Design an enzyme around this catalytic site. Sequence first.
Site: not given
Length: 291
Positions: A181, A215, A221-222, A262
């Site tokens: 998370d 994601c 994450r992508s 990100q």
Amino acid sequence: MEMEKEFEQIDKSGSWAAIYQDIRHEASDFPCRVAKLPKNKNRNRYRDVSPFDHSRIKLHQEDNDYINASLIKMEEAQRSYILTQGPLPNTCGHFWEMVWEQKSRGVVMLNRVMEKGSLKCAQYWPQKEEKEMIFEDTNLKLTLISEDIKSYYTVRQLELENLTTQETREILHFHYTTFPDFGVPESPASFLNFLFKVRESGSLSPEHGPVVVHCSAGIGRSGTFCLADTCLLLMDKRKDPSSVDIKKVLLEMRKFRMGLIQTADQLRFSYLAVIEGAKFIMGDSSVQDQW
């Protein structure tokens, strides 16, 4: 390898935030006019994450061709990816239509349906064999064929049928369930083992349409997945772990979709993964067995 020198010097001076901010500043800005049209509000998961007009995937319907998805075309690596947001309750039909029209063989899912106690993605694939899904709007049928659950990821074989035509295709669904998370894994081993599982499946290969990667927003994450894969591919093509500049490859990808990677954490983890992965690429084929 030069990337390992840079990593260690950035770490030594704790300037990952500074390096990452630099990337944010230099990253491309292109228009997203179509994403922002009023008719498309309910097709977007996040107001601040939109596909650029120039690289968006267009649906082949004359109705509304919009989906929040970008074609990331890596010319030198000779690899293409589609990065998309996690399907919304009203966009699952569109999602599978894109998979179909783009001739994708694999879907890579990097999030859990629920994270941080909130819904990040619609339940867009069937969870039981006996309960197939029909997407009435796009006339596609989707059936869970088999499911192979491991400790940190799950692979499913799906059958996607075009109900208009009744032609069917097998889609492989690679679901990475243990990206935390907050932050990133401390070791890139699980992640790399996952990526190489995707590779071995054929899903990333030129005989097929580009793999679909998502994601929740389809950038964090992508971005990590596609960045690592492309970097490892370039290293393999050139056999030169020194000529591959990860910040430049990242900037190249950001020409096609905004916000890829990100957080400074995700950037550092990306270096980690490429560095650890390059041991396999460069002739040490046993490192895969230890992953």
